[PDB]
Amino acid sequence: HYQPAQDRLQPHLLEMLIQLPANSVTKVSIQFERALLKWTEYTPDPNHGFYVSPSVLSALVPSMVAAKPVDWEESPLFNSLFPVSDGSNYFVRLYTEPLLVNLPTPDFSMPYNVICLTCTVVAVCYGSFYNLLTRTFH
């Protein structure tokens, strides 16, 4: 199941069910591209980076020994956190570590020089065209 992101609205979501072969290692990979944000959308320390949240892994892991049914009012509290469906497996939920990623940044010091320079270029074009279209050779 895949849900695509929308800028400033919602994140990506990816959910997969994979069968892992015995005595092996499996790799999952996907490519991404970094974005340039507006100068007002960065944190007070913008050269630190952003965090990707840890990922979740859930599985039913095989057991060395078979377990008997248990009553929750007579068992230790650390044995009654997850309901047990079968006596030959047990449920686990693992979390990975977070990741730190950097983005390209703009210049936070000059929001006002940019306006002047770009408007100057547009004005150059306007002046050339007006002078050429309005006047006449003498």
Binding site: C119, T120, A123, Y126, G127, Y130, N131
Partner: peptide, 8 residues
Amino acid sequence: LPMAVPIL
């Protein structure tokens, strides 16, 4: 200023 000096 660049725009309106030529026109009017």
